[PDB]
Amino acid sequence: KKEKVEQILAEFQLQEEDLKKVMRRMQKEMDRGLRLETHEEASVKMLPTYVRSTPEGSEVGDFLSLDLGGTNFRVMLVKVGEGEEGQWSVKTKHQMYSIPEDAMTGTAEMLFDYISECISDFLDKHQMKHKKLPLGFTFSNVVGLLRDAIKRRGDFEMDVVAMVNDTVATMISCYYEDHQCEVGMIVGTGCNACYMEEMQNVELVEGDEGRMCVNTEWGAFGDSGELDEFLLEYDRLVDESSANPGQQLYEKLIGGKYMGELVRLVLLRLVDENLLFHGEASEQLRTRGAFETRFVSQVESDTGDRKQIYNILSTLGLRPSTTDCDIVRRACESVSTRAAHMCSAGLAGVINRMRESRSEDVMRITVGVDGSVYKLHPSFKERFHASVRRLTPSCEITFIESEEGSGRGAALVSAVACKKAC
Amino acid sequence: YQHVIETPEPGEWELSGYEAAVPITEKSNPLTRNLDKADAEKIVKLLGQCDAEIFQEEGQIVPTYQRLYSESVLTTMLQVAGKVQEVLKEPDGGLVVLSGGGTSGRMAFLMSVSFNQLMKGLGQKPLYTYLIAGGDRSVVASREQTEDSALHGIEELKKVAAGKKRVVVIGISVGLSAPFVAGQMDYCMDNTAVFLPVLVGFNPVSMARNDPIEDWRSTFRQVAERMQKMQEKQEAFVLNPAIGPEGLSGSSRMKGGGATKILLETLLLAAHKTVVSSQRCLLEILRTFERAHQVTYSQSSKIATLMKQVGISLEKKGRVHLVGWQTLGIIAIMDGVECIHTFGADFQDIRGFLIGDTSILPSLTETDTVVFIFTLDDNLTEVQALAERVRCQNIQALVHSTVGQSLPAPLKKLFPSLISITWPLLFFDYEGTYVQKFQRELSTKWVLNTVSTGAHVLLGKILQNHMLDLRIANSKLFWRALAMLQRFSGQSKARCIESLLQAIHFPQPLSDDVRAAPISCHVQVAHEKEKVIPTALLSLLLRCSISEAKARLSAASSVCEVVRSAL
Numbered sequence A: 001k002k003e004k005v006e007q008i009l010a011e012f013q014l015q016e017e018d019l020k021k022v023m024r025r026m027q028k029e030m031d032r033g034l035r036l037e038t039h040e041e042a043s044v045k046m047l048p049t050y051v052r053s054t055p056e057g058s059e060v061g062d063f064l065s066l067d068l069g070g071t072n073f074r075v076m077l078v079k080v081g082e083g084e085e086g087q088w089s090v091k092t093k094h095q096m097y098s099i100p101e102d103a104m105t106g107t108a109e110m111l112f113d114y115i116s117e118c119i120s121d122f123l124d125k126h127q128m129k130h131k132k133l134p135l136g137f138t139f140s141n142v143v144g145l146l147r148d149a150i151k152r153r154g155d156f157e158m159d160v161v162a163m164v165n166d167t168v169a170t171m172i173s174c175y176y177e178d179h180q181c182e183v184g185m186i187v188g189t190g191c192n193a194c195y196m197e198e199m200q201n202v203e204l205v206e207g208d209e210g211r212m213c214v215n216t217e218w219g220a221f222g223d224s225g226e227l228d229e230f231l232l233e234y235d236r237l238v239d240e241s242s243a244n245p246g247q248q249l250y251e252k253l254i255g256g257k258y259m260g261e262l263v264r265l266v267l268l269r270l271v272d273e274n275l276l277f278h279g280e281a282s283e284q285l286r287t288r289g290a291f292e293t294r295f296v297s298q299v300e301s302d303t304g305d306r307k308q309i310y311n312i313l314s315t316l317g318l319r320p321s322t323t324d325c326d327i328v329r330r331a332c333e334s335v336s337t338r339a340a341h342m343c344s345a346g347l348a349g350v351i352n353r354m355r356e357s358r359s360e361d362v363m364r365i366t367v368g369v370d371g372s373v374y375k376l377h378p379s380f381k382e383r384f385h386a387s388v389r390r391l392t393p394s395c396e397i398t399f400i401e402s403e404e405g406s407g408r409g410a411a412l413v414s415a416v417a418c419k420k421a422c
Numbered sequence B: 001y002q003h004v005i006e007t008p009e010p011g012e013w014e015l016s017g018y019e020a021a022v023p024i025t026e027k028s029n030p031l032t033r034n035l036d037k038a039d040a041e042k043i044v045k046l047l048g049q050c051d052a053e054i055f056q057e058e059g060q061i062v063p064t065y066q067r068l069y070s071e072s073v074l075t076t077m078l079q080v081a082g083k084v085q086e087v088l089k090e091p092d093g094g095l096v097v098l099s100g101g102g103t104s105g106r107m108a109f110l111m112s113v114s115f116n117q118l119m120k121g122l123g124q125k126p127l128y129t130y131l132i133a134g135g136d137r138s139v140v141a142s143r144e145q146t147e148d149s150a151l152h153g154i155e156e157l158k159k160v161a162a163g164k165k166r167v168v169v170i171g172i173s174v175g176l177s178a179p180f181v182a183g184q185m186d187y188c189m190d191n192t193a194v195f196l197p198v199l200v201g202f203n204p205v206s207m208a209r210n211d212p213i214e215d216w217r218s219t220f221r222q223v224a225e226r227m228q229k230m231q232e233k234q235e236a237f238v239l240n241p242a243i244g245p246e247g248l249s250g251s252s253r254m255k256g257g258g259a260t261k262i263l264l265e266t267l268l269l270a271a272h273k274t275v276v277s278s279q280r281c282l283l284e285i286l287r288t289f290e291r292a293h294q295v296t297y298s299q300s301s302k303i304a305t306l307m308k309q310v311g312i313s314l315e316k317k318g319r320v321h322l323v324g325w326q327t328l329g330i331i332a333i334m335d336g337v338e339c340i341h342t343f344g345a346d347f348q349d350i351r352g353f354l355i356g357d358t359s360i361l362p363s364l365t366e367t368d369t370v371v372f373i374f375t376l377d378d379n380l381t382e383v384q385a386l387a388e389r390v391r392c393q394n395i396q397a398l399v400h401s402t403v404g405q406s407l408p409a410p411l412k413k414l415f416p417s418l419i420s421i422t423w424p425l426l427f428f429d430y431e432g433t434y435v436q437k438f439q440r441e442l443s444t445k446w447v448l449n450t451v452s453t454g455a456h457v458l459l460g461k462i463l464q465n466h467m468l469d470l471r472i473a474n475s476k477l478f479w480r481a482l483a484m485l486q487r488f489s490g491q492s493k494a495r496c497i498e499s500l501l502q503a504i505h506f507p508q509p510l511s512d513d514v515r516a517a518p519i520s521c522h523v524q525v526a527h528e529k530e531k532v533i534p535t536a537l538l539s540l541l542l543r544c545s546i547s548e549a550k551a552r553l554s555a556a557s558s559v560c561e562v563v564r565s566a567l
């Protein structure tokens, strides 16, 4: 009769006036991360990449793929251009090197030197030895071992941003299919985004001609107390128990890493005052990391017969009723929505900036998306879109998932090898 | 936008023919009339402003002074670069020489290592060498009097030029003064089949020194004038852009050194990059050096705090150590070493050290200050070991990094107020890194020159913007010394010379032999004398004598306060 749960789950309710507020606070702190002066002060660092569209003969899709496994080591060069028919085209080049016994059997340093030797070769042959190409390292500190071996060598030099995230590998893997794709986003265990920004608005780069992919690193949003007012009790507790207190606050409101725990602490708030398991805090329910995120995905995939939900509670030593199990539906529901609504605020802040940096009133853009929390969570993928389009009028957004059978920095190498076939 | 200027050029300053006869490299800067009493924050701003004038593109509609961005200079730079690439294509019998005295000479050294490194990186035979007056010892020490010989420069050139077929000789003299350079230029023009002389300085040719050279029949102005004539036939080139006076009068090591650095690096990089329009490219590079100015001086607040730290140590009879990694260590050494002659510091006061390709540390004390200068591409393990041992608590570091890299956690704890300089990425094929290196060297130089300059000013060792306590160690400085007397006394040229010579030879008598003696005699006798300037000046202002002035100064905290009081 109380309906007190609705009062508690109101804590997670965010109105549009609140979401726009985030979007603005978001745009501000990613402007600061682009401005040379306020870069070191900014939570959102907005690091750039080697991914760029420029007159000097660089297009988004240009890529250098290293793959290693067994004695064999492969190198691929992806290059985007314009075809004979002036068509958007792609051309690939491959080369396979054999690793000597002594190098493979030897150290890690003995190895990445042979590697940096076989890269100079490949690049000196295709005349691409100093044209800084995005880098990805597939397999069958590693990011640094490779840089070191090169610095020791004297042929050429790569910066630390050559290596691409999974967020940008996403964007590219999608761009090959949907050239209008200029945003890339991950929402899984973690959360991060990248997008194409006007080189003139990027101060941390030498050049104002063209546009560049910028890794936002927006997970650290809130580290400067930009969110102090949106944070709840439950939100602060996780941070104090986490390995990185006072960091990645934004990514924590949405992380698939701490999404499950965020339900648990809500349940422990209900048992303390309310009729949820009649005050019985289970032996497992009081344990940290018990309530895995894979649960909230299951409870919300419940076909309304409660069976899928019972199967989870019957695992936590909990024997529920027809009443309390449906609150757990509402608990997860109240988090999932906030996780989506929060993510939609950030992505809107990006899109709206791309429209302000463009002389178009209507912007038909495309987004390359990936992530467990996105692709598998039942309701998340949608309630997300909804919030976004409410925050970005005059923008025909088109979302596209990165295809399966492919993970990272290799979706990219496969998604391209399947387009020389054209 | 005729020139895509990054940082705003400073507001045009006071400069014209009515301002002063005296060439601009020697003129007092209108922005520093109150330098003597400025606080740390105001000093960084002023010297940063002065440093920026080098980038300032022409002002008035009528060129009073061909500035750096003027069409004339860029064209000349292009023309010279045209000649260099012809040599680079023919390494066999080819050689590229850079020459100068003092700091101009030290930049040449720096240029030769770096550009030889570039060729080596391409698997090419290194073609650069440097010639510094007094030889390699002059790179690290004050041996300025050695430049007063034209024959020495020619002699040093013949040895290195031996067996070559085509040799470019870039003679650098900010003030257009050094006989050492003049002799080389003159010699080259008698044989244009082999030699191509290039003159670098920052006054109009008409303001070049025209006093007699002890071992040469042509004056500096005369050799340069012949080159100007010869430039019309493309057999020689004169590159003399306007950059303006130093924040500290005659301190050619500062703006002049930075300007020396930028002019040569820009045109030479362009030549290597070219091998046909490179006008486009020369500007791209110049705009790179321009950005290094904003990046460095955005840290003005931290520089001022540092200025106070160094100044505090020195006032307290402390010592200053500059520990630099790789080529930044050389830059550190060059800074400290220049303080000896520029000012009156001891060689122990400020010293640079090079880590890379135990005696000091064990003897370091708590009143000493140590500054560490490195990049994040350096051996941070070696840095950390040395850093941890020093604790000696009065420490700070200057670190250059590329966007994306972050300083290790342990170094953050050791340096909670580190001077962090962030650099945007360069997409220059191959030379990206070389340009990256040069701007880092220039940045370090600006900080250190600003710090050391600022550090001495706070102790009252200057007056307005002049080296009042200067020691007359060569002929250029002698004329400079003389000009200072005319400026502050307002008395005739004749009255000031007599007083100066009397002070040099003091306690010796006046005579006809001294008045007619060659300048070379005066330099040998004067080079080791002290407080020569303040004695001569006090004698002039109070109608007094040299002995009365000497008693007064000893009773005073400095030569400066005594003169300010008299003025």
Ligand SMILES: O=P(O)(O)OC[C@H]1O[C@](O)(CO)[C@@H](O)[C@@H]1O
Binding pocket: B101, B102, B103, B104, B144, B172, B173, B174, B175, B176, B177, B178, B250, B251, B252, B253, B476, B477
């Ligand atoms: O380029 P310039 O005018 O010959 O100066 C060379 C040297 O002379 C000095 O002015 C010393 O007299 C220094 O600044 C410099 O190292």
Ligand code: NA
Binding pocket: A199, A200, A201, A202, A203, A204, A205, A206, A207, A208
């Ligand atoms: Na830019």
